[PDB]
Design a protein around this ligand. Sequence first.
Ligand SMILES: CCC(=O)Nc1ccc(N(Cc2ccsc2)C(=O)Cn2nnc3ccccc32)cc1
Ligand SMILES: CCC(=O)Nc1ccc(N(Cc2ccsc2)C(=O)Cn2nnc3ccccc32)cc1
Lengths: 302, 304
Amino acid sequence: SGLVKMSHPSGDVEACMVQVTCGSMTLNGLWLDNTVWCPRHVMCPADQLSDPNYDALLISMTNHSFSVQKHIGAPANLRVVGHAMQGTLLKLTVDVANPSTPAYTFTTVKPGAAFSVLACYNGRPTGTFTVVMRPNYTIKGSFLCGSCGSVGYTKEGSVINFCYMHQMELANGTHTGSAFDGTMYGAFMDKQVHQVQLTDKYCSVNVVAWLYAAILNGCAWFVKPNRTSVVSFNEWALANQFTEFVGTQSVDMLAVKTGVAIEQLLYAIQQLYTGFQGKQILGSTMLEDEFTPEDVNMQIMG
Amino acid sequence: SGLVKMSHPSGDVEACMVQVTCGSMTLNGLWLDNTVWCPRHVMCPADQLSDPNYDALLISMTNHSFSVQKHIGAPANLRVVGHAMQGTLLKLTVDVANPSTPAYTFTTVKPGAAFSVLACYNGRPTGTFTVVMRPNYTIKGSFLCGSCGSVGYTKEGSVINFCYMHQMELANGTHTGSAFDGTMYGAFMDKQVHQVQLTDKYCSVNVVAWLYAAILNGCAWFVKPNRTSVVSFNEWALANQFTEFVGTQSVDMLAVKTGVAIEQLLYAIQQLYTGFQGKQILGSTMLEDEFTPEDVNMQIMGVV
Ligand SMILES: CCC(=O)Nc1ccc(N(Cc2ccsc2)C(=O)Cn2nnc3ccccc32)cc1
Ligand SMILES: CCC(=O)Nc1ccc(N(Cc2ccsc2)C(=O)Cn2nnc3ccccc32)cc1
């Protein structure tokens, strides 16, 4: 028993991190087969960060402008033999296929979804943590300058789903990046300018997941017979900083195992939003929305 | 910027996990060169869990009573060619040295200290998280049956400090295990019998660390000129379920970077623990004590 923030084992991804340097700029990249992905602002000189002409910058580059070093677990000398730009990413081609490339996919995650981040500096992995893609297409991470190119991922069986490459800090403790299709989450621009963020919201389906966890750990005081329909909850949510609740098969399994219906928890949420009346739930005096239904099924029930 | 719960990259340790089997019983083990470590309760029949005679169980076994297998990386079986017990652990000698053995040492963690855990089932890594050794020598983890033998560690340079091997659940969300000298944290017994816990406490020096993190992240409303000396804080702590505060150079560095004195934060804690009066600190409405001084220096200052 117990529920805590958990990340995927990082070994597979660690073996894929490298350093990328272009002029006076260096950061992290991801080495999959013959490709090395990194943020394109690695091209950008310090005096143009607030207004990069990425088209011009790409034109000025040759394969010799890029230095790619493997700093852990290999005597790998990596020659760049091709370079291209795909959205906010660079795609560099190298003359050697990463012998430790995992089975993998590229997937764009939606709000409320969780993934593991492998924080990296100069191609050296330093730490791992889990984040949720906030409803405003930010994440709440722990990143310092030099962490760009750190990757985010999930894992289904042996397959690694790469879904995030770290790009920028937007405000204290507020970060964003792109999917590997090159699209930036939240459409934030990779320029050094201040950019307004939309309002954050409680991830309703994750709060339900978390309450199911509570019930399965013997904490069920908030459960009453009373129910609120999905439809009525979703109207209330719009007025009260909650996302729309969409049920999944993962949520339904928690309902089955506990015998407590989703609609009882939607009711509970409307009562708990008002406050906990001096009580707690799994050690918290506030609603938690960074535990997903899948995460709870994994941790409570295997 | 940002402060999150952070664990060590786990790849080094992943390559050392195996499954240990003793008849109908199975759990996880740690393969370092020639030796496989695992909990000795792998030997105990359901029959006997409440009152196990481990000495008697050991002599009833031969090398053939055990087997080991490697699931991650290149799969293999590892033949057992010797067996021994050290405290609450077995040391099984196997016929192949782990070719991916890291540099490591065996340490014992003290209360308030943090380490990473690699949760494993059937010798397969499933997740990682970070815990603090509570003042009552438990940790607050996430473990299912089958997770026994999962390890906890920290890392200095290349050297992995193995400090924990998971043994048992004591109560809901409450766990303990042993150090690799075989001694159980808190001197809990590896027996299925109820055992009372000592009182858990707020880890004061960690709470101080987290308030510094807050200040460094633009959250400093609780900072006032008011102070409380350490000694006077510590007399207060005895009475209000806080640990004795002991300063360290790690803490001192944070004081300097922020220009806010430990004593000011000790005063703040005395006000905050009754509640934040509707305000928030790093998104929390309660004191957080699982962020260590060293962890905050690393995450925010970049210093290790
Ligand atoms: C040539 C040397 C150099 O320093 N380049 C550079 C690159 C990126 C950034 N930006 C802003 C931005 C975005 C697109 S273009 C510029 C970050 O947000 C970097 N960043 N990412 N996570 C951070 C966390 C803390 C501080 C800075 C952080 C700043 C500087
Ligand atoms: C197949 C036979 C079998 O079940 N053996 C067995 C071994 C250990 C335990 N105990 C208690 C204990 C200790 C020494 S002797 C008994 C745990 O706390 C196991 N444990 N560890 N983390 C857990 C998390 C949830 C449930 C049980 C957990 C329970 C059962």
